[PDB]
Amino acid sequence: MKVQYCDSLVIGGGLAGLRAAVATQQKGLSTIVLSLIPVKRSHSAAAQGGMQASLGNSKMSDGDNEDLHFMDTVKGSDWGCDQKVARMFVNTAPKAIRELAAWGVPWTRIHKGDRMAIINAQKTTITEEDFRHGLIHSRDFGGTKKWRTCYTADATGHTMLFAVANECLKLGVSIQDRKEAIALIHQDGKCYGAVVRDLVTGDIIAYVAKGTLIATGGYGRIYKNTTNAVVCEGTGTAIALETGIAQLGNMEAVQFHPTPLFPSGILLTEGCRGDGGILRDVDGHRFMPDYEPEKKELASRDVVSRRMIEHIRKGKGVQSPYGQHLWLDISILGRKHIETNLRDVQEICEYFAGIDPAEKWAPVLPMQHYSMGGIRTDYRGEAKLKGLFSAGEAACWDMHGFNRLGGNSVSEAVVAGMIVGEYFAEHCANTQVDLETKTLEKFVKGQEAYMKSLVESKGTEDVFKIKNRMKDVMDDNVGIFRDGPHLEKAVKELEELYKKSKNVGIKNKRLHANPELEEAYRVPMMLKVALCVAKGALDRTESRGAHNREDYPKRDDINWLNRTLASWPNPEQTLPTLEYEALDVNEMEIAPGYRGYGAKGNYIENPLSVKRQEEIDKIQSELEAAGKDRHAIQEALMPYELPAKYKARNERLGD
Amino acid sequence: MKVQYCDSLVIGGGLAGLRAAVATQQKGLSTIVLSLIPVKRSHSAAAQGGMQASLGNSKMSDGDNEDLHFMDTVKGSDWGCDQKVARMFVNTAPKAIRELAAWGVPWTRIHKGDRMAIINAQKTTITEEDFRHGLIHSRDFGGTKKWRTCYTADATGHTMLFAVANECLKLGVSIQDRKEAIALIHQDGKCYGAVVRDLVTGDIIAYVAKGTLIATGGYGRIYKNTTNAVVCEGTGTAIALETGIAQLGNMEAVQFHPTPLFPSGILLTEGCRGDGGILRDVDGHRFMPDYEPEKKELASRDVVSRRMIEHIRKGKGVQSPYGQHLWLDISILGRKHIETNLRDVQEICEYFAGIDPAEKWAPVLPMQHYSMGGIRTDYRGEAKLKGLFSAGEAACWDMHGFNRLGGNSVSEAVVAGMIVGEYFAEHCANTQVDLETKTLEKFVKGQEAYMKSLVESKGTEDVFKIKNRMKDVMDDNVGIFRDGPHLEKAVKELEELYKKSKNVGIKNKRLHANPELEEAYRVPMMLKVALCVAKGALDRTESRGAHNREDYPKRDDINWLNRTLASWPNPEQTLPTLEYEALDVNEMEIAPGYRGYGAKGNYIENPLSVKRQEEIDKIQSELEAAGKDRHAIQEALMPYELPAKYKARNERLGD
Ligand SMILES: *Cc1cc2c(cc1C)nc1c(=O)[nH]c(=O)nc-1n2C[C@H](O)[C@H](O)[C@H](O)COP(=O)(O)OP(=O)(O)OC[C@H]1O[C@@H](n2cnc3c(N)ncnc32)[C@H](O)[C@@H]1O
Numbered sequence A, B: 001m002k003v004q005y006c007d008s009l010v011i012g013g014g015l016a017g018l019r020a021a022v023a024t025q026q027k028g029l030s031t032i033v034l035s036l037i038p039v040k041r042s043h044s045a046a047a048q049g050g051m052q053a054s055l056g057n058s059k060m061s062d063g064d065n066e067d068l069h070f071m072d073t074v075k076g077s078d079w080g081c082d083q084k085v086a087r088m089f090v091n092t093a094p095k096a097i098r099e100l101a102a103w104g105v106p107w108t109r110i111h112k113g114d115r116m117a118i119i120n121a122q123k124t125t126i127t128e129e130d131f132r133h134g135l136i137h138s139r140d141f142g143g144t145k146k147w148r149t150c151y152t153a154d155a156t157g158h159t160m161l162f163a164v165a166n167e168c169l170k171l172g173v174s175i176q177d178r179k180e181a182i183a184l185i186h187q188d189g190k191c192y193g194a195v196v197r198d199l200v201t202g203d204i205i206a207y208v209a210k211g212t213l214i215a216t217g218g219y220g221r222i223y224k225n226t227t228n229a230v231v232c233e234g235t236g237t238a239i240a241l242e243t244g245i246a247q248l249g250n251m252e253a254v255q256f257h258p259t260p261l262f263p264s265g266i267l268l269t270e271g272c273r274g275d276g277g278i279l280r281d282v283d284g285h286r287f288m289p290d291y292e293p294e295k296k297e298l299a300s301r302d303v304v305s306r307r308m309i310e311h312i313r314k315g316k317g318v319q320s321p322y323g324q325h326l327w328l329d330i331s332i333l334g335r336k337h338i339e340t341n342l343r344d345v346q347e348i349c350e351y352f353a354g355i356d357p358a359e360k361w362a363p364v365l366p367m368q369h370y371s372m373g374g375i376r377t378d379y380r381g382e383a384k385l386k387g388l389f390s391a392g393e394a395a396c397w398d399m400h401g402f403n404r405l406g407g408n409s410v411s412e413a414v415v416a417g418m419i420v421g422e423y424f425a426e427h428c429a430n431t432q433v434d435l436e437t438k439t440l441e442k443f444v445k446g447q448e449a450y451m452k453s454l455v456e457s458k459g460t461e462d463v464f465k466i467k468n469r470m471k472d473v474m475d476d477n478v479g480i481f482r483d484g485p486h487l488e489k490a491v492k493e494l495e496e497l498y499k500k501s502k503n504v505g506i507k508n509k510r511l512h513a514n515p516e517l518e519e520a521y522r523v524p525m526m527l528k529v530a531l532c533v534a535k536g537a538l539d540r541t542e543s544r545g546a547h548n549r550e551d552y553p554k555r556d557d558i559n560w561l562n563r564t565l566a567s568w569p570n571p572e573q574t575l576p577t578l579e580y581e582a583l584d585v586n587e588m589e590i591a592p593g594y595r596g597y598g599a600k601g602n603y604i605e606n607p608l609s610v611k612r613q614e615e616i617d618k619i620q621s622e623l624e625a626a627g628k629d630r631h632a633i634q635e636a637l638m639p640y641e642l643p644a645k646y647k648a649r650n651e652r653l654g655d
């Protein structure tokens, strides 16, 4: 038997996994990072929008602080997030930016002077004073009043990922790529590592550790149309689920992006519409103003996606051999503007769409983009299965609730990497594990037998036909608009798909470097994940954040002010087990209310919300009258925890 | 913390360790072999005499079988061996030779014809028939009536070691050199591996396994004068001893060789006197005939050593700045004979002694050569500490008792490697271990702290002066002739030396590649080993095999028909704890009697021996009269065990 030991095992080499690895390795814990691919190729590398952090450096960022970022996050989540976690996040984001700056991330900087900027409420001139010169800049992104999105020109995710990966190399972290975790090793409710398949040699290896952290990203590829890399299949999510103990949170909470290139899904940055990009239909008609007279194209991304689907359903979509889509016209911004401020988007449409944006319109359609759902953890990042931690998009630390803020996800990956990294390091250093070879052998032999059965299967089902059908079912029934009737149909078909995945037969019999065998064990995993999404969507009879039920259009703060928890305790069951974790309004710094975007009064008020709100207004007034600072007031409303190392306040320009 | 896992851990890369590694690796058990040096440089490589095995191929081997080899072994051991183990050995030796032949070992072969041979009772002509041509040859060695010592010209140990090492490479065994086991990891009476120090980097690593086998060789370097390589310091013996659970058997049973080159200790093969080499004193006088009128130069090696010391004590030794010695005259054999049959010995005297043997005499003196004592095991090779096995010279499987047969030790290394290898493999495959990180950390941290204390010690003792004094004490008081008075003095001084070794200070502070630090932790270990030897010698009031007490000249079969078992249960004690394991005459195929060599009636008879003897003669007669074969008779006298794979009989020329 092959066994590899390390004090801290990290599964996933994206921003979250790599940053957590830095945290453990810097304190002497031997750590290993497992990854399907070279870590610098992780999906994190594709982020071009930016990272949200309340620095308050630039003119349009002036006055920004943790409180404002906190409120945008909570309201954006439509109150589905754990507000204490959101607080941990916003207070740490500024230090994540600054640490990365010290690590060499080339953040775009502010230069003194006037600038021709688009405010879309007063596209005037912005002035940056001399004292702001040379500091980290910020741009309009995510719809926040305060511009706090930091960026490194047009490749933020890329430069951030490379810096953290390089730090891991500096520290001697053991990076092992083309290695896939296919099962978690656990006993007595504790996680001792993972069974890993070497994608090159086919060897099955047991990686044991005092603590295991899953940072495997999102599960967007269960959909046909997604902006995600082809490796975002949620297998990390599935192995946690298959332990029968760890739970997944809000898997039905999936966010879509309105303007990905159709049908590839290659992203066309938000800056397009933010600069002046126009959405047109089959007749070249600018339709957003018809649905949103005021906001128009600049409405909340959430609203734009809905309007786009509505317009298509009204029969105004463009017919295509790949399906219906709409148009994105950016030529109207002028060739000059495009080649100087959107040189990146121009290259995309040419290299892939084969068209010059300064002349022709780009085909677009809303597609799956971010996974708010994931492995459920406490505020420390630990799952119900002791010793198993999770961070990044793969988790449901839940700072996002039912709607993640644009720019908060790459921010979370690094921030969670830092925070969960500390708690994870503490766990690995203080915990003591009992590694029984009997248990290790059972898991390793179990997976070797599984691989053998797949290779020897005489089944007649085709894995690709099954995977492709799953993706259509998800796109057709679990998209932007959902209804009970279609969701019930989806669940039934997914369950049938799952059963058939067990009768798959493959042509190539080798155990090494076999992409076909890889699909054979990944697909069944993706189906169980899809089932948690679809079933969670069917059972959640309300509309909240990105989850829209046409048959239940209102946000129900009385019956659904909670979090869906999915599990799969019995390996024989074919449907996930769903339970609910209620959100306590008493522990909320901000009581439920109007989210800011979308129709008003579209939520069923909870009497407890009103009570808490009054309680909040009272505490504020009293303390505010007593001449108390925002910090003391915050503590009085909702105290939260932070590792000692990050307890400090964030110095800002002007203190 | 650094941890390495394997199913089967082998400590020692000599014939025994490498052969055992083949046994485990061939059945799919991941195995690691740790060694201080490249495995092909192990002491096993120096064997030039040969390997004893009852093939019965040559004329002088005609009629040889397991029974004859068995008797030579038992009588040679002066009845201190476990006869069942001796049976396992002799029955397997033939297959060890044959397996090695299949592995390419270039055994010298028989050619048809007459040959000028020295019988030293009738130096006549020997004839090899045509049917013997091409089969494995044998030579006169070890004083056995039947010539059964197989050899590959003048480098048997070398070719044997290389073949087994190459087989390990073929099978993918993990060979890790410049790695030293400095402590065994154990808990609840079970062994889970070893704490290892990387000699190059200084890293302290825990090697955990389901089973651990120690095959670290002998402990001859505790003596100033020895034929052993400089790495035979018995540290493997010491780490077993320091667990406080494993016991060492007959550590006082040390064998000397009569003619090593003085003072280097470089060996001058037995073939010298066997061919006609003459021992001379300070006056050039051939003295052996004076003490042994009949046998003379050709007396038992055991007797020659004693006579040599006696002659020196009579004041006839040659004075030298390194001490007193005698002369070995081989010139008398004629330059022609020497350069054709002893070309090897000629090169030795020239390359080191700087003299031409065909002209000048070589200085010689009896020196420590083989360690019968070692880690005590059952017939399977397992020690009292469960999961810890031992094989080769490092063990006291006890097929040697108090006097190992010339040619039986390289034979044992491979045979034990095969047999203990099977039982070891079985244990590793069937046992299940509970590896607690708490325990691993305790042992690893304990050794890191130890290394640090040695490097920070402000002690004023010099490690080399202490090591050199230990070696003089051993040579002066625990040699060929021993007496209570001197042994008591030796024990007291060794104990004092041990206490002072704790106040050692070293100049070089680095943790990596530090030969001085290596001595700092090895010396204290050697002292504890030396204490077991000296104390065992003091307490054993009798003369048996190689253990000669001038104050107790007789072999005491009444009070000392047992085996000395040494342990060190309390790390605070400064002297070893000694217990005794009695040998049951009822389980002996051959009752105690005259060993064949030395003075007659020099043993105190045990009434039980006489009873058993009669019982044996009876069983033989009856079964023999009933026309029963030697195999059925053997089973009736003393049944023994063998792994299934080696249960077969050995086909011989003539069956
Ligand atoms: C898709 C996307 C997302 C995105 C974005 C643009 C695109 C095209 N732009 C963003 C932006 O401007 N601002 C922002 O805040 N977020 C933006 N996002 C989303 C964001 O990039 C992601 O949420 C974030 O990068 C997620 O980071 P995370 O570290 O969690 O994950 P990852 O980078 O996807 O890496 C996952 C790693 O897991 C390995 N893996 C997966 N499964 C396994 C198994 N079974 N075994 C072993 N390793 C596994 C992957 O190989 C990878 O390294």
Ligand SMILES: *Cc1cc2c(cc1C)nc1c(=O)[nH]c(=O)nc-1n2C[C@H](O)[C@H](O)[C@H](O)COP(=O)(O)OP(=O)(O)OC[C@H]1O[C@@H](n2cnc3c(N)ncnc32)[C@H](O)[C@@H]1O
Pocket: B011, B012, B013, B014, B015, B016, B017, B034, B035, B036, B037, B038, B039, B042, B043, B044, B045, B046, B047, B048, B049, B050, B051, B052, B157, B179, B180, B181, B182, B215, B216, B217, B218, B227, B228, B229, B231, B232, B235, B236, B267, B369, B370, B391, B392, B393, B394, B406, B407, B408, B409, B410, B411, B413
């Ligand atoms: C010294 C000698 C012995 C000898 C002989 C000639 C000489 C000069 N001629 C012989 C002969 O003709 N016929 C015969 O039957 N025996 C003869 N012998 C004795 C015989 O060679 C030995 O008994 C035999 O070779 C012993 O084999 P074994 O496999 O037991 O041991 P080894 O070869 O000495 O190797 C020991 C290994 O252990 C490693 N080691 C030691 N301590 C440690 C620690 N602490 N950690 C890790 N590794 C360790 C050594 O590096 C080595 O590889």
Ligand code: NA
Pocket: A371, A372, A373, A374, A392, A393, A394, A395, A396
């Ligand atoms: Na998530």
Ligand code: NA
Pocket: B371, B372, B373, B374, B392, B393, B394, B395, B396
């Ligand atoms: Na021994």
